[PDB]
Amino acid sequence: GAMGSMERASLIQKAKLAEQAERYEDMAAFMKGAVEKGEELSCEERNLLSVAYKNVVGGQRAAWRVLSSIEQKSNEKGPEVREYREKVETELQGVCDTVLGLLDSHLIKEAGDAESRVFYLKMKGDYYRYLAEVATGDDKKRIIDSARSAYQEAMDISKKEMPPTNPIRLGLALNFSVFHYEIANSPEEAISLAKTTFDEAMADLHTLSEDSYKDSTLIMQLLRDNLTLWT
């Protein structure tokens, strides 16, 4: 790897610089290098990894949707729209495969605490969900089940080990509800999960400090926003 010669601490420092510079491809490469040092990641380091790859794949997802819409409308201009949509699709799949590779070698198996294990399993669900968004052939069903299985394991741990206001637990429930609605064609499961998550978090807000209250209520507003859209 191109970052094998750089100190772990230097990789983390440069990831933070790249975030400030809005250089998210660089930030992702730096954090990939940090993960490959083999040590477990702190909560702040997991945030750097998450921010970097979410921004990279988010740009690819946005581009893919633009190109897929143009392609759908065209279906004569020749093969160029399909070719270029396929190009972006393959790059997107490559990023998802890279993230899933880091999680499987060996972030998840070394994650023993609830916050680390739930965060990584949520990540695994998210990047399979992104693969599912572009999947069509004999692989779409297996990709969807891989996302479901990762999210479900994360949910089982989070319900046993975290309070209902924990932001990792809340963001996991939010993303699993999006999975149900957008990917698995299960809007009623999505709505049920969103409502139950919101209501249990509401009842636990009284236990929080002002700083944790801010974090929990932000994700709860997103659950509400989706419920408004879905109903």
């Binding site: 998450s50 921010v51 979410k54 921004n55 509800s177 999006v178 997103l222 859209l229 879905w230």
Partner: peptide, 9 residues
């Protein structure tokens, strides 16, 4: 309109 997933901090 698309559903909202968890944002970046």
């Amino acid at each position: 309109q698309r559903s909202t997933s968890t944002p970046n901090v």
